[PDB]
């Protein structure tokens, strides 16, 4: 004391919230492209006929 | 077996035969024509723009 109260310091309590990955388990593939759009093709192939 | 008094002769028992079955296979014949119209437009595993 006197001019100023003396202190001891203890360890700093650092909480660190995260947002852990859950829905990215269903998105396995990473495909990069330097192009404008991404197109797909869906094709239904009717086979089961006598 | 039939009961029979021991003075008399006895009795004849009938029999039976059998049957037959026969079959024939059917016949299947499909086909496809192949025009240029079924060739010329684009198939899915071909890049857009060029071919």
UniProtKB/TrEMBL annotation, chain A:
<comment type="subunit">
    <text>Homomultimer.</text>
</comment>
<comment type="function">
    <text>Assembles to form an icosahedral capsid. The assembly is primed by the interaction between capsid assembly protease and portal dodecamer, and major capsid proteins assemble cooperatively to form the procapsid with the help of capsid scaffolding protein. Major capsid protein forms hexons and pentons of the icosahedron. Viral genomic DNA is packaged into the procapsid through the portal vertex. The packaging triggers a dramatic reconfiguration of the capsid shell.</text>
</comment>
<protein>
    <recommendedName>
        <fullName>Major capsid protein</fullName>
    </recommendedName>
</protein>
<comment type="similarity">
    <text>Belongs to the lambda phage major capsid protein family.</text>
</comment>
UniProtKB/TrEMBL annotation, chain B:
<comment type="subunit">
    <text>Homomultimer.</text>
</comment>
<protein>
    <recommendedName>
        <fullName>Major capsid protein</fullName>
    </recommendedName>
</protein>
<comment type="similarity">
    <text>Belongs to the lambda phage major capsid protein family.</text>
</comment>
<comment type="function">
    <text>Assembles to form an icosahedral capsid. The assembly is primed by the interaction between capsid assembly protease and portal dodecamer, and major capsid proteins assemble cooperatively to form the procapsid with the help of capsid scaffolding protein. Major capsid protein forms hexons and pentons of the icosahedron. Viral genomic DNA is packaged into the procapsid through the portal vertex. The packaging triggers a dramatic reconfiguration of the capsid shell.</text>
</comment>
